[PDB]
Each structure stands twice: as structure tokens, then as C-alpha cells.
Amino acid sequence: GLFGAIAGFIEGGWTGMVDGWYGYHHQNEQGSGYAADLKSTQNAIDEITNKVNSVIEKMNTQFTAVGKEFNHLEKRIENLNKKVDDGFLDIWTYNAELLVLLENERTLDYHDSNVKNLYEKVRSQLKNNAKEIGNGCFEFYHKCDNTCMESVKNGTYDYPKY
Amino acid sequence: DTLCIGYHANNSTDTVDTVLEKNVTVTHSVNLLEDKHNGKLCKLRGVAPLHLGKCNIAGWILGNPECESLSTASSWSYIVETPSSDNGTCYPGDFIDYEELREQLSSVSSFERFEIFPKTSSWPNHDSNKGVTAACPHAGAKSFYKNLIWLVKKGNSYPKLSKSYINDKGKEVLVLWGIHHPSTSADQQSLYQNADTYVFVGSSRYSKKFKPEIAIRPKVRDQEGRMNYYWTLVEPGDKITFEATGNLVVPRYAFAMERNAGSGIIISDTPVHDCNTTCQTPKGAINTSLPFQNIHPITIGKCPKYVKSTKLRLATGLRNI
Ligand SMILES: *[C@@H]1O[C@H](CO)[C@@H](O[C@@H]2O[C@H](CO)[C@@H](O)[C@H](O)[C@H]2NC(C)=O)[C@H](O)[C@H]1NC(C)=O
Ligand SMILES: *[C@@H]1O[C@H](CO)[C@@H](O[C@@H]2O[C@H](CO)[C@@H](O)[C@H](O)[C@H]2NC(C)=O)[C@H](O)[C@H]1NC(C)=O
Numbered sequence: 001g002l003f004g005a006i007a008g009f010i011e012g013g014w015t016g017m018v019d020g021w022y023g024y025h026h027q028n029e030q031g032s033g034y035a036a037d038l039k040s041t042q043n044a045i046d047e048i049t050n051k052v053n054s055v056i057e058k059m060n061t062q063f064t065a066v067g068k069e070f071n072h073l074e075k076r077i078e079n080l081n082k083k084v085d086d087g088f089l090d091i092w093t094y095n096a097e098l099l100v101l102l103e104n105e106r107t108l109d110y111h112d113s114n115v116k117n118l119y120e121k122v123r124s125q126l127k128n129n130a131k132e133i134g135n136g137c138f139e140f141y142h143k144c145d146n147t148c149m150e151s152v153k154n155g156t157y158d159y160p161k162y
Numbered sequence: 163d164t165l166c167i168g169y170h171a172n173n174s175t176d177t178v179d180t181v182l183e184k185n186v187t188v189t190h191s192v193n194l195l196e197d198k199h200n201g202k203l204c205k206l207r208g209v210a211p212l213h214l215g216k217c218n219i220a221g222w223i224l225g226n227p228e229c230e231s232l233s234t235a236s237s238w239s240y241i242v243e244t245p246s247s248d249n250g251t252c253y254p255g256d257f258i259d260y261e262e263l264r265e266q267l268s269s270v271s272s273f274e275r276f277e278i279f280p281k282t283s284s285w286p287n288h289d290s291n292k293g294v295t296a297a298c299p300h301a302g303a304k305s306f307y308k309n310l311i312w313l314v315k316k317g318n319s320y321p322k323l324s325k326s327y328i329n330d331k332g333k334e335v336l337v338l339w340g341i342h343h344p345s346t347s348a349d350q351q352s353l354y355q356n357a358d359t360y361v362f363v364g365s366s367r368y369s370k371k372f373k374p375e376i377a378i379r380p381k382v383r384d385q386e387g388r389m390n391y392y393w394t395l396v397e398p399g400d401k402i403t404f405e406a407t408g409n410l411v412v413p414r415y416a417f418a419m420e421r422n423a424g425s426g427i428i429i430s431d432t433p434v435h436d437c438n439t440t441c442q443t444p445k446g447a448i449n450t451s452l453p454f455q456n457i458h459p460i461t462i463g464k465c466p467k468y469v470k471s472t473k474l475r476l477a478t479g480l481r482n483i
């Protein structure tokens with residue numbers, strides 16, 4: 001949505017990849033398949049978890065007994081009381097509604113970002129040794145087998161080749 | 163040989179909203195809004211609520227003949243009243259500062275009912291037996307409040323009475339009493355022979371003299387007369403004095419009481435239960451970690467904030483494809 005990746009130049013997700021949120025799909029001479037990025041998916045989970053915990057944990061309410069009783073000759077304080085109840089009701093409803101909206105836009109942008117970053121980390125690592133397709137996919141000019149796969153994943157990619 | 167990258171998707175049908183887009187289907191999410199109570203008047207800290215059943219606070223404390231069988235307790239976190247409770251003041255009259263009394267009684271640490279003025283040794287110059295009425299019926303028979311004694315004149319005599327109790331307890335004592343206002347001057351001398359009478363109740367802090375207002379009120383429960391109910395909290399080591407030439411519904415039972423501020427009174431039909439809760443509503447208890455609830459505005463305890471929202475789904479996963 002914001003980083004051009006998810007629902008962008010990579011238009012589709014993988015029902016096939018069920019190991020993590022972000023991860024690769026190799027296509028070499030030893031077979032195919034999906035493999036979720038270990039470090040990336042783990043961090044996202046931790047941080048998204050922390051996010052959810054914050055919105056919740058920061059709510060430490062006072063011990064109060066809402067609701068009071070007034071006789072027929074105290075309609076005024078009864079309405080004052082109703083006003084303070086309707087006030088808190090409007091504040092909390094509005095804030096909660098917008099908190100969720102705002103945070104939801106940040107959460108998707110957060111995920112969108114991690115994808116873009118994963119793509120970039122691979123791209124600024126294979127430079128000439130491969131070409132971009134445009135669909136978030138690269139094509140190797142140099143035969144890349146399985147242990148030639150990982151050097152990219154592990155982020156430890158040499159550069160001796162043609 | 164190809165090495166690409168992408169994301170995750172599933173059979174998820176969860177939809178969330180953002181600032182920019184509505185009904186966006188996500189892979190995963192969670193609900194920040196609580197909308198589920200157990201439908202039980204569960205207890206609060208670990209203390210149970212005081213359920214009054216067919217009686218209200220008034221009836222329970224005054225000792226209405228009907229309010230017999232609920233009160234063997236020592237403490238309560240809050241008070242429960244049923245919308246169908248009407249056994250309160252059987253004899254027509256005004257309960258002074260009633261709502262205040264209820265608020266103070268809403269939560270009690272210790273609560274014991276003791277006989278402050280024993281019927282038989284304290285009122286020797288007055289009849290402590292003829293004080294009944296058709297207004298407060300106990301199975302057909304004419305009865306009265308248990309915790310109060312309606313003192314009438316003994317065979318054509320009502321000498322000035324003067325009793326006074328001193329709080330030897332280590333907690334405040336709730337003392338209740340009544341001032342009877344007869345309907346006719348004939349009823350006045352019939353009950354307490356003197357025509358011009360007065361009641362006085364005083365402590366270290368409380369002090370007031372009462373003059374009986376004799377007149378004909380519209381019949382409520384057959385009584386054209388009225389009976390005003392008064393109460394006060396006498397401090398430990400303090401004493402309260404009574405002094406009457408008639409018309410004084412004297413205290414029989416008082417209440418040694420230690421109260422903790424900050425509870426309430428729930429009017430609900432919902433069943434009382436042996437369960438634990440941190441937040442109580444009239445509809446049921448809430449067992450939640452979520453920040454917001456849309457169950458009920460009126461709440462007791464440490465509760466999530468009341469919101470008018472129908473749903474507050476928070477996106478945790480990504481888009482879905
Ligand atoms: C909820 O109330 C409190 C939890 O704080 C628990 O209290 C004790 O329960 C035991 C078991 O019967 C009693 O012996 C204790 O006397 C209770 N405490 C008090 C203050 O009386 C209680 O068990 C919990 N009940 C439930 C259903 O969770
Ligand atoms: C308890 O509350 C009920 C609710 O009114 C009282 O019920 C009435 O009972 C008296 C007793 O004879 C009758 O005079 C009324 O006609 C009854 N009402 C109905 C619906 O029939 C009851 O009196 C209260 N208990 C006492 C003794 O105060």
C-alpha cells in the first residue's frame with residue numbers, strides 16, 4: 001500500500017508458503033518449493049505482538065462503580081451524571097475507533113515494508129549476476145543450485161562469478 | 163533457475179477497516195472489543211454481593227417482617243436488588259437521606275447486627291408490645307419492623323423517656339429510628355397521651371429536635387398517618403442520646419459497621435453465582451483482558467472502557483489473496 005510491494009509489483013501472495021509471513025520460492029535444478037524467511041518473519045511476529053500488547057497493557061483502569069441513584073428532586077445531578085457518562089462514552093468510542101483505523105494502516109504498511117526490504121536485500125546483492133523480471137522475481141545468469149540458493153537467504157553471497 | 167519472493171494467504175475471511183480503505187480482508191487479526199459476559203452476578207475481589215431478593219435496602223435494614231431470610235453475612239463487595247423488590251417501608255413515610263444510606267451500605271467490610279436497646283430492660287415506663295400495625299403484616303397478623311420498636315404509652319401514661327447508648331465497638335454503629343406522625347389528634351392521645359410532644363436525638367455530631375406533624379394524609383396502605391425514618395453513624399467512643407415525650411419509634415437493633423468507599427448497587431434479575439470476576443455489570447460479569455467492552459455502560463470494579471462500537475477488529479496479518 002505504501003512501499004509498492006504488497007498488492008504492487010508483487011501482486012500475489014502464496015497460500016503455498018505456510019512457514020512464515022515473508023519467504024522465497026526457488027526454482028532450480030534440484031526442485032522447487034516455498035521457504036519462509038526465518039529472521040524476518042520472527043521479528044515481525046515479535047514486534048506485531050508487542051504492538052497488540054501495548055494497546056492493551058496501557059489500559060489500567062481505576063476501581064469505580066459507575067451509576068448513581070437520585071430521587072425525583074435530584075434530576076439535575078442525575079443529568080450531570082448522565083453527561084459525564086455520555087462524555088466518556090463519546091471520547092472512548094471515537095478514540096478507540098480511530099486508534100484501530102490508524103494502527104491498521106501502519107500494520108499493513110509495516111508488512112509491506114518488510115517485503116520491499118527483503119526484495120531490496122536480495123537485489124543489492126545479486127547485481128549483474130541476475131536480472132529483475134518486475135514481478136518481484138529475479139533470473140540468474142549463473143547456475144544457482146540449492147547451496148547457491150541460501151547464500152542469498154543467509155545474506156552471505158559471494159561475488160566471484162559469471 | 164529462479165529465486166523470487168512473496169507473502170502469505172489463506173482461507174481467512176476476516177475483514178478490517180483502515181483510514182484509506184473499508185472491508186479489507188486480512189490473513190490474521192484479533193478483536194479488541196469485548197462483547198461477551200457470563201450472564202452471572204459473579205463476585206468481585208473474592209467477596210460475594212449482598213443479594214436482597216424480594217426486599218430493598220430500606221426493608222432489609224429496618225427489618226421488614228418479609229426481609230427475614232437473606233441476612234446472615236459479615237461483608238459484601240456490592241449490593242444486588244431485584245427490579246421486582248418492593249418490600250421496603252411497609253408503613254408510609256419518608257426515608258431521610260435514603261440514597262445516601264444506600265451508597266454508604268453499598269460495600270461493607272464488617273457488618274454485625276446487635277441489640278442496642280433490649281426490648282425488655284430498656285423501656286420499663288412504656289409499652290413495648292402494642293407497637294404493631296396492619297401496614298407491616300406477618301402472615302395476616304399485625305406486626306412491625308424487627309429492628310425497631312414502636313413505643314406506645316403504658317395504660318394512660320407516657321413519661322419523658324431518656325435512653326442513651328455509647329459506642330463501645332471499634333467501628334462505627336449505624337443507628338436507625340423513626341418519628342411517627344399520627345393522622346388525628348385523637349390518635350395522638352390514644353397512642354402517647356400527651357397532645358404537645360417532642361423527640362430529640364443527639365450525639366457528638368448529630369442533634370435535632372422533632373415535632374410531630376399531626377394531619378390526614380391520603381391513605382397509603384390504610385394509614386392516613388406517616389412515619390419518617392432517620393439514621394446516623396455514631397463514632398467509636400461516641401454516644402447517642404434519645405429523649406421523647408412520645409411519637410418515637412426507638413431503635414432495637416443497631417449495626418456495628420466498617421465500610422470501604424467506592425462500590426455500588428446493581429438492580430438486576432441475573433442469578434447470583436459462586437464465581438470470580440474483576441468487572442461486574444447488571445447483565446453479567448466480564449472476564450477480559452481487552453481494553454474495551456460494549457456490553458453495558460454501568461459497571462463495577464476494574465473494567466474495560468465502555469464503547470458504542472459494534473466491532474473493533476485489529477489487523478495482525480497482512481492482505482489476503
Ligand atoms: C474467587 O474468589 C476468591 C479468589 O480471589 C477465592 O476465594 C476463596 O475460595 C476458597 C475455596 O472455597 C475459600 O475457602 C476462601 O475462603 C475464599 N476466599 C474468601 C475471601 O473467602 C474463590 O475461591 C474464587 N472462586 C472462584 C469460583 O474462582
Ligand atoms: C411484600 O411485598 C408485597 C408486594 O406488594 C406485598 O404484597 C401485598 O401483600 C399484602 C399483605 O396482605 C396485601 O395487602 C396486598 O394486597 C398485596 N399485594 C398484592 C399484589 O396482592 C406484601 O404485603 C409485602 N409484605 C409485607 C408484609 O410487607
Ligand SMILES: *[C@@H]1O[C@H](CO)[C@@H](O)[C@H](O)[C@H]1NC(C)=O
Nearest residue numbers: 177178179184185186472473
Ligand atoms: C464495510 O465494513 C464496515 C466496517 O466498518 C461495515 O460497517 C460495513 O457493513 C461493510 N460494508 C460492506 C458493504 O461490506
Ligand SMILES: *[C@@H]1O[C@H](CO)[C@@H](O)[C@H](O)[C@H]1NC(C)=O
Nearest residue numbers: 199200438439448449450451
Ligand atoms: C476466565 O478467567 C480465568 C482465570 O483468570 C481464565 O483462565 C480464563 O481464560 C477465563 N475464561 C474465559 C471465559 O475467557
